[PDB]
Amino acid sequence: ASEVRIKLLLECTECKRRNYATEKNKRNTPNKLELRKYCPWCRKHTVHREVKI
């Protein structure tokens, strides 16, 4: 992790709870990450969006 390589949270797009924490290079991947992850509250897979940490 550095200034360019940030830590970030993944928020379930449906119920809105952050379920995952990961990292990206916001110069290499300047867009908000969108990732299908398992959400344990919805208890199904859902698109997760990068949300500020």
């Binding site: 992790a1 990961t22 990292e23």
Partner: protein, 64 residues
Amino acid sequence: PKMKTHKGAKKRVKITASGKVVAMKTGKRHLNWQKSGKEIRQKGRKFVLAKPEAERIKLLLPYE
């Protein structure tokens, strides 16, 4: 006079029914982002203190 209970131990630890000493696992207080789900999950549990350190701590818990 009478021994005083140590309150550092009292807030971190418990004497089990058979006299073991159980603490929360360490190392998920922060810096968790790059730690695998395996790391966070197994760190979310209690563990049994090794016998040398446990007997020391129970001596600090004279009235439990």
